[PDB]
Amino acid sequence: SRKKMGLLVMACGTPYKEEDIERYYTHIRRGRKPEPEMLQDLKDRYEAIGGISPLAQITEQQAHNLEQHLNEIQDEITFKAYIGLKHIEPFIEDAVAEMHKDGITEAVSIVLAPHFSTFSVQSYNKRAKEEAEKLGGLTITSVESWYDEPKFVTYWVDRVKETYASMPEDERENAMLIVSAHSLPEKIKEFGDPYPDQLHESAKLIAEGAGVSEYAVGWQSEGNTPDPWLGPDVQDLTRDLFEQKGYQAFVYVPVGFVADHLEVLYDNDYECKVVTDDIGASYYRPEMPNAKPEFIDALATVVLKKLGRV
């Protein structure tokens, strides 16, 4: 008799259509509606990267493929996936309430972001556990980080190796690897937040496995509050490294992100590409994991290790 468990898969969320941009960004901006010029700019950015609908499908495909793969690779537990999002429905609290309604009493959760931080992961896990306590009769064990799962490191190692192998010889010998995640306010350091240290370790592990001796760590997508954010930003970092040593190719691995959305398809593939085009360097950014089987198997291993079953 297989034990039934909920599988709570958490992520940032995306709009589902253009008419959701206003409410999604209002939520991100803590209740402040974007001005009309910003709404129009955002619509244009989503159009430029191919549209909203495909981006909105990825978390669903990740959760569905993870549920089915976990149920196939072991015989003790039957998982059912529930998606809980930060900035649009279904919200984290909606997902926990659905688990409770459906008779789930025991769940494991994972955030689709590999590094722990106090701003994101800790907040998602605390929200899920508080809703479970309010409803009663349900407990959640939560994954806190997974950047160091060997199967996840290997996903990026093999993509980097392929990109370097594809380069002309002069590029391969004069290239720079930039490994990045979403910036946060520097003030997280007051709490001892390990997020920066974990990004640096991701970068070390990926460069090491791929045999890439020249690499750098940067941040992207910072906000505009007056307090300093973690830097350097990838755009400034790229230009500075070019001025120092004249690299002919830049390879971007935004390891903090696991799915296509604006902060990769725009903040790397447009904003960093503007800089590389300006300095005459080639631009490379290997594929995001999305719902590919190699990545799903890494996530399933993370979950089963957390439960002590591997």
Q: Which does 116 bind (CB under 5 to 8 A by kind): ligand 9UM, Co ion, Cl ion, none?
A: Cl ion
Q: Which does 72 bind (CB under 5 to 8 A by kind): Cl ion, ligand 9UM, Co ion, none?
A: none
Whether the ω angle into residue 90 lies within 30 degrees of 0, i.e. cis, is: yes
Q: Could you give phi then psi for residue 126, rounded to 5 degrees?
A: -65, -40
Torsion angle of the four alpha carbons 57, 59, 60, 66, in this order, in degrees rounded to the nearest 10 = 140
3-state secondary structure 195-248: HHHHHHHHHHHHHHHHCCCCEEEEEECCCCCCCCECCCEHHHHHHHHHHHHCCC
Distance CA 26, CA 87 (A): 9
Q: Any contact of residue 49 with ligand 9UM (CB under 6 A)?
A: no
Based on CB atoms, which residue is closest to Cl ion, 143 or 217?
143
> Binding residue for ligand 9UM (CB under 6 A) from 16, 28, 90, 283?
28
Whether the ω angle into residue 232 lies within 30 degrees of 0, i.e. cis, is: yes
* Closest distance to Cl ion from the beta carbon of 296 (Å): 18
Cβ neighbours of residue 75 closer than 8 Å, sequence gap 6 or more: 2
* Closest distance to ligand 9UM from the beta carbon of 216 (Å): 21
> Binding residue for Co ion (CB under 5 A) from 120, 221, 248, 276?
221
Distance CA 91, CA 74 (A): 29
> Binding residue for Cl ion (CB under 5 A) from 94, 98, 106, 144?
144
The footprint of Co ion on residues 40-59 (CB under 5 A) is 44
Q: Any contact of residue 111 with ligand 9UM (CB under 6 A)?
A: no
Distance CA 5, CA 105 (A): 7
Q: Any contact of residue 107 with Co ion (CB under 5 A)?
A: no
Using the rule CB under 5 A, give the single segment among 70-78, 124-132, 158-166, 246-254 that binds Cl ion: 124-132
Q: Any contact of residue 257 with ligand 9UM (CB under 6 A)?
A: yes
Distance CA 55, CA 62 (A): 12
Q: Any contact of residue 120 with Co ion (CB under 5 A)?
A: no
Q: Any contact of residue 68 with Co ion (CB under 5 A)?
A: yes
Q: Which does 217 bind (CB under 5 to 8 A by kind): Cl ion, ligand 9UM, Co ion, none?
A: Co ion
Q: Any contact of residue 295 with ligand 9UM (CB under 6 A)?
A: no
Question: How remote is the C-alpha of 117 from its chain's centroid?
Answer: 12
Using DSSP, how many helices (H) and how many strands (E) does the chain show? 12, 8
Using the rule CB under 6 A, give the single segment among 209-217, 231-239, 256-264, 283-291 that binds ligand 9UM: 256-264
> Binding residue for ligand 9UM (CB under 6 A) from 148, 263, 269, 271?
263
Q: Any contact of residue 122 with Co ion (CB under 5 A)?
A: no
Residue identified by tokens 């400034």 is: 236
Could you list the residues that contact Co ion (CB under 5 A)? 44, 68, 217, 221
Could you list the residues that contact ligand 9UM (CB under 6 A)? 12, 28, 257, 261-263
